[model samples]
Target chain A: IGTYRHVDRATGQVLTCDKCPAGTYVSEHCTNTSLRVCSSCPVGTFTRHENGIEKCHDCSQPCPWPMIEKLPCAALTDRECTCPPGMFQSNATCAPHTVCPVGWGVRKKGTETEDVRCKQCARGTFSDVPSSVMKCKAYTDCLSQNLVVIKPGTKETDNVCGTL
Target chain B: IGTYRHVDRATGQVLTCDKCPAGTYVSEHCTNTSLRVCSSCPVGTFTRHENGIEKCHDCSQPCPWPMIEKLPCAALTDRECTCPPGMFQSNATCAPHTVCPVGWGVRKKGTETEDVRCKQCARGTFSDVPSSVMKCKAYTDCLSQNLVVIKPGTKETDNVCGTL
Candidate 1:
């Protein structure tokens, strides 16, 4: 491996062989009296696996959309990818961020590594329906609208207005 | 429109609007109460064109083998291709180097950009048969071989071998 030295199976005699350098591999095996023949790996192909090989393997595949490459592919290694902010991996795709449904509040902001976390709205807060921008809007005050509260606002429903 | 500000058709009042930024195109134009709705160019598409457009054009296609990319495809630029070493463009495809036959010599070796050039051997040189590696061999001296000249060598044919 390091240097061309092989022992004869029958005679136990130490023989010489040629060593392939980095960036190249053995194309042909050496004869008892001849050195090994080597060839260079073609572009876009790489081999870190040691020892004699006919050819190198191709680099890793490219990452999909919303998942940017964290590392570019190199001769010895494949590329790596990760989601950016406001996106998370799901169904093999990096899905974009969306706020929690209407009544749910933003317990935690969305991150590239994790999805948005949601929590129930408090007594004073209420949301009408599903929304991306609205986390949990404040319930309308009955006095401001010159109306009376019929049923108090709940986490899942908006405030109900009663005529004065 | 910087901010959609134009005279209204019916009310004779000025309305406001907005403009989309570069790299993006307006899928919906500006309206009286709404700005121009914009979206990014989809993958494999680009819009270097500044004026508002509905969609972006597709990027250039990948190049074929032998003719490698001189420049990569970009949102604003197209890809380009050129021949590789030991080959030259011929009828659109990169052709391999020409191996000169017997009686002909290589005047210029093939390059990635140009084809090989050849020339006929002079009167003093001769080749017995087809050859690629050996362009043309110098005529053998009959006196040195201890034989009389049967026929003087020519570029097209070798000297006839016989005792005279």
Candidate 2:
């Protein structure tokens, strides 16, 4: 085994590199054996043991394509993966954009921070196809042909004259 | 046949007349059933059969004493009786003035008509004694002793200041 000594550049303390666990590097050294210092694992890797480590190993697997793994990964535990252009990490996992089915669309029930859910337009209402958040619009364009009867309990029905 | 003729004094028209029936008295003579006339039935009496009678018959039973029947009884119908003072006619019969029970009082629900049903005073209000009409003063007077919570839905309880 190669004999190595740790050195604390700021405090001028000196110790051996064996105090740190494997997979981690030591930048500072301490005069006292118990005060030995160590550096963090290199980017893209982590050290779970306490033994002296020469160098960090590469991440178990590179993050999926187009995603670059970030350093530390302390809070993440596993390798960090970043979502590409149109994707996002929601609930700790990369997810594709949610597309509503035909005749339905995404609507913001509350503030923009909240997740959007698919909503169906009420009768007599329509919404232009939306790429993102959308709101419904009244079916005023078909009024002349639809002959709407606005009574207390009768909702506006979107029935075109030809289709009725 | 006794053929008798009499000349009209004023018109000089000669006519023959028939004798009036027993219960009726004829005041004018008629020729060819053109000018027969008789006196009216007296008050409290009426005639149903037209027998050329001299007088109508009195009612079988006069309306209850001192009640005062406005319309006399006809030969085929009984007299209609009027309600005495402090009394009312309900269901075609006379009844004494109605008084509301405890926790309730009488009030006119609508226009002041001869026939009107009494209504109960709303909660949180009262009317002293039984009356057809009440005022705010009367309502306040009806409150039981030791009233602390004089608000809606409050029931009779011991007075506790600011309990409402």
Candidate 3:
């Protein structure tokens, strides 16, 4: 089923040739009287399947920093690489997750595929520092704590309390 | 040479079957008298070598923010990605080059794989602004300019000059 046709120069006849196996290349095509000849792939090269090609493909080099190697190149497959956790692939490279600024809160945490989503601190909430993982905290209930509010909380600060 | 042994379901016979070509999958194995059948890989899928498998691999998704797609996926290969210049890999992601602070200068410029190296200004040299690419400059020579030095230069300032 995988036979390919070749012309016999001396006999002027069309001949069928068998393909080389995976991890090998066709050193010589089959002739009217001889079967195909195959050769093993050289170092740092591969042939993933049985093929009629004459040369093997080169293996991939080491991945750049920040991009981790997932699978090393082998005789049967190419190397695979991927970004580490907490980083997402940008147009040209993997980038760290974006941090939410003060007065904002994280709406959704970032994943390997998406950047962190942020929203402005809503009323009754406050966020005093930038962060990639934290959400705004709810305003403290001073009365419930048996204390009076000495200073009202703002989007960027917590409420200051004093004894009644 | 690339044939595989397959059992005929109805005839209880072992048959040698040819493998599929790159970018295709074996749809049916060979029988006593019939050859194997192969199907082309579907869209968004690939088979890197001749195989006796039933399915192909899926293509990679689009890169996130800054990572660029170096090679598009094809029937026989997957997509490739890479980072741009002025950024280097840092653990899990790419980071912008470091900026030398005032009173310091760039000792070596950063590249795609390394961060900017900084050095403190030495005697007679000064740096008045933060930068990632700038080096320290020699303090202005008031005498060479035919002017008297009104104020001495420091690591973070240039000499103040006055007319003689």
Candidate 4:
């Protein structure tokens, strides 16, 4: 009997049985007059595949951080993971967005996929030190009678005005 | 024990027994005066210890439409829902807010729970199919030969150019 295992004790009839389904286990073998008995797996453990085995399989491990759990392990499926919100994937690792420090202005805003890009102030604009959200402010046009440029403005530094 | 599982074939005492609990199974039948035998869940189907069972129900349902599922169901609780960008919960459903159509203006701002509320532009104001955020424009000033107010604007129509 390649597959057939048991027989009917009373009629001497031959018998066969199928594997248990996921989330359950074979509690008893089949007899000539009956089918295999099945029962639910314990709370934490599970068997995802159908099998003829006597026992179910154990649960899977939790996903690691930087990557958050996308889905938890269950009787039917294993756990899954992905980058957390606001964090972008880079070289297989999840990283936070870059922030433009003070004195620099944002050239491009950060998105879930890309980091923030920054640039220096323009000739007419000036900024002391601020976040990328800060914009370059125009220097005080010192034309009120005798005001003149003492120091010219640059991308990184603001201009200084003096009396002519 | 008349309060155990089975009635003895020859011994005559009646048996009584309790039903099997979730984490345990029946191992043997009792005699006319005894209870049935039970064993804890085994191997992959068991825990380090034993206890009475509470029905460990299923989960993973009610995964709301639109937004992705944040957490999968567990033996303890079902799944949860989250609002997507530019959308929010309204009457328990995730829906996009309305953008006020042209010729109308916002009577009240939209919120996560409420969609945009709009109102007709007043007689003095006119909107050429404006956004919810835009206010109605005032009618242009026009002088007549008679110097008394001539053309007029209405809630539905813009100010007239010539004399009324």
lDDT of 4 by residue, A1-164 (tens): 01334555666766666555544566776664234655556655666555545676766666556675433344433445656545666776788756555456777775545766777766777677756356666777766626888888765566787875
Query: Would you estimate the TM-scores of all the predictions?
Result: 0.29, 0.26, 0.33, 0.28
**Which parts of model 1 are misplaced by more than 4 Å?**
A1-74, A77-164, B1-62, B65-87, B90-103, B128-134
Each model's DockQ?
A: 0.01, 0.00, 0.01, 0.01
- Winner on lDDT (2 vs 3): 3
TM-score of 1: 0.29
- Candidate 3, residue A105: the lDDT equals 88
Question: Highest TM-score, which number?
Answer: 3
- Local accuracy by lDDT, each model: 0.60, 0.45, 0.74, 0.54
Kindly list the per-residue Cα lDDT of model 4 for residues B1-164, writing each as its tens digit: 11234555677666555444333444554453233444434433432112223233344455466654332232222334555434567776788766666667777776545666788787677777646455677776655433334556665446666543
Cα lDDT tens digits for candidate 1, B30-140 = 544333455544445555534456676776777787576433342222445667545678887988777677778767766667777777887778666653335677777
TM-score of predicted structure 3: 0.33
Categorize the docking of model 4.
incorrect
Model 1, A1-164: lDDT tens digits are 46566565556777665555443456664554334555444445555534455576676677777576443343333445677545777767888767677678776766556777777787788777764435777888887988988877788887788884
Q: Which structure is stronger by TM-score: 1 or 3?
A: 3
Cα RMSD, each candidate:
16.9, 50.5, 32.0, 35.8
When summed lDDT is taken over every stretch of 10 residues in candidate 3 chain A, the lowest stretch is: A69-78
> What docking tier does model 1 reach?
incorrect
Task: Report the candidate with higher TM-score, 1 versus 2.
Answer: 1
Q: Residue A65 in candidate 3 has what lDDT?
A: 75
Ranking by TM-score: 3, 1, 4, 2
Segments of candidate 4 deviating more than 4 angstroms: A1-14, A88-93, A97-164, B1-164
